[PDB]
C-alpha cells in the first residue's frame, strides 16, 4: 500500500532524535518498576502504567508515518 | 509481673495482610501475634483484626472478648489460618479498629 503519490514525508533528524528520546524514556520507565508478591502493587505503579498509552501511541504514529 | 506492671487493657491487634508480608514475614507475624497474645490476662479484653483492602475480623468474634484460655486459643487458631493477598489500605484498617 503506497497510496499512489501524495505530499510524501521525508526523513527529519529531529524526528529521529525525538523517537530515540522516547525509547530512552521507555527504558527508564521499565527500569523504575518494583514487582511485589501476590497482588500487592506499589503506589507508583499506577503512575508508571499511565505512561504506556502515550508511548505506544507515539511508536504507532512513527511506524505509520 | 504483667499484672503488677500495668493496668487492664483493651487490646485490638491489627494484623496487616498484603502481598508484601507473604513468605517469612507472615510466619514472623503469626508467631509474634501468638506470643503477644500469651502476655494477656483474664482482666484484659482482646480482639484480632486483619486488613488487606477492607478490614475484617479474623475469627468469629466481632466486638471484643475476654482474654480467657479459650478465647485466646480461638484467636491463635484464626491468626494461624491467615493468608496474604491484596494491596494495603491503612485508612480502612485504622477506621475499623
Ligand atoms: Ca504491603
UniProtKB/Swiss-Prot annotation, chain A:
Each of the four internal repeats contains five hydrophobic transmembrane segments (S1, S2, S3, S5, S6) and one positively charged transmembrane segment (S4). S4 segments probably represent the voltage-sensor and are characterized by a series of positively charged amino acids at every third position. This is Voltage-dependent P/Q-type calcium channel subunit alpha-1A. It comes from the Eukaryota. It is linked to Spinocerebellar ataxia 6: Spinocerebellar ataxia is a clinically and genetically heterogeneous group of cerebellar disorders. Patients show progressive incoordination of gait and often poor coordination of hands, speech and eye movements, due to degeneration of the cerebellum with variable involvement of the brainstem and spinal cord. SCA6 is an autosomal dominant cerebellar ataxia (ADCA), mainly caused by expansion of a CAG repeat in the coding region of CACNA1A. There seems to be a correlation between the repeat number and earlier onset of the disorder. The chain crosses the membrane at residues 14-32, 51-65. Residues 33-50 are extracellular. It comes from Homo sapiens (Human). Belongs to the calcium channel alpha-1 subunit (TC 1.A.1.11) family. CACNA1A subfamily. Voltage-sensitive calcium channels (VSCC) mediate the entry of calcium ions into excitable cells and are also involved in a variety of calcium-dependent processes, including muscle contraction, hormone or neurotransmitter release, gene expression, cell motility, cell division and cell death. The isoform alpha-1A gives rise to P and/or Q-type calcium currents. P/Q-type calcium channels belong to the 'high-voltage activated' (HVA) group and are specifically blocked by the spider omega-agatoxin-IVA (AC P54282). They are however insensitive to dihydropyridines (DHP). The chain holds residues 86 to 150 of 2506 of the full protein.
Swiss-Prot record, chain B:
Glycans are attached at residue 81. It is found in: Membrane; Cell membrane. It comes from the Eukaryota. Proteolytically processed into subunits alpha-2-1 and delta-1 that are disulfide-linked. A divalent metal cation binds at residues 16, 18, 20. A motif (MIDAS-like motif) lies at residues 16-20. Isoform 1 is expressed in skeletal muscle. Isoform 2 is expressed in the central nervous system. Isoform 2, isoform 4 and isoform 5 are expressed in neuroblastoma cells. Isoform 3, isoform 4 and isoform 5 are expressed in the aorta. Binds gabapentin, an antiepileptic drug. The MIDAS-like motif in the VWFA domain binds divalent metal cations and is required to promote trafficking of the alpha-1 (CACNA1) subunit to the plasma membrane by an integrin-like switch. Dimer formed of alpha-2-1 and delta-1 chains; disulfide-linked. Voltage-dependent calcium channels are multisubunit complexes, consisting of alpha-1 (CACNA1), alpha-2 (CACNA2D), beta (CACNB) and delta (CACNA2D) subunits in a 1:1:1:1 ratio. The alpha-2/delta subunit of voltage-dependent calcium channels regulates calcium current density and activation/inactivation kinetics of the calcium channel. Plays an important role in excitation-contraction coupling. It is linked to Developmental and epileptic encephalopathy 110: A form of epileptic encephalopathy, a heterogeneous group of early-onset epilepsies characterized by refractory seizures, neurodevelopmental impairment, and poor prognosis. Development is normal prior to seizure onset, after which cognitive and motor delays become apparent. DEE110 is an autosomal recessive form characterized by profound global developmental delay and hypotonia apparent in infancy followed by onset of seizures in the first months or years of life. Belongs to the calcium channel subunit alpha-2/delta family. This is Voltage-dependent calcium channel subunit alpha-2/delta-1. It comes from Homo sapiens (Human). The gene is CACNA2D1. The chain holds residues 244 to 340 of 1103 of the full protein.
Amino acid at each position: 500500500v503506497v497510496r499512489k503519490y501524495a505530499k510524501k514525508i521525508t526523513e527529519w533528524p529531529p524526528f529521529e532524535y525525538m523517537i530515540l528520546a522516547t525509547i530512552i524514556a521507555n527504558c527508564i520507565v521499565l527500569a523504575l518498576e518494583q514487582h511485589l508478591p501476590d497482588d500487592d502493587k506499589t503506589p507508583m505503579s499506577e503512575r508508571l502504567d499511565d505512561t504506556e498509552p502515550y508511548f505506544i501511541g507515539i511508536f504507532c504514529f512513527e511506524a505509520g508515518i | 509481673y504483667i499484672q503488677g506492671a500495668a493496668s487492664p487493657k483493651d487490646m485490638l491487634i491489627l494484623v496487616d495482610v498484603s502481598g508484601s508480608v507473604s513468605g517469612l514475614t507472615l510466619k514472623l507475624i503469626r508467631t509474634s501475634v501468638s506470643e503477644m497474645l500469651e502476655t494477656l490476662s483474664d482482666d484484659d479484653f482482646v480482639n484480632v483484626a486483619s486488613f488487606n483492602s477492607n478490614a475484617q475480623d479474623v475469627s468469629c468474634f466481632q466486638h471484643l472478648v475476654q482474654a480467657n484460655v479459650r478465647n485466646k486459643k480461638v484467636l491463635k487458631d484464626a491468626v494461624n489460618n491467615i493468608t496474604a493477598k491484596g494491596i494495603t489500605d491503612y485508612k480502612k484498617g485504622f477506621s475499623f479498629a
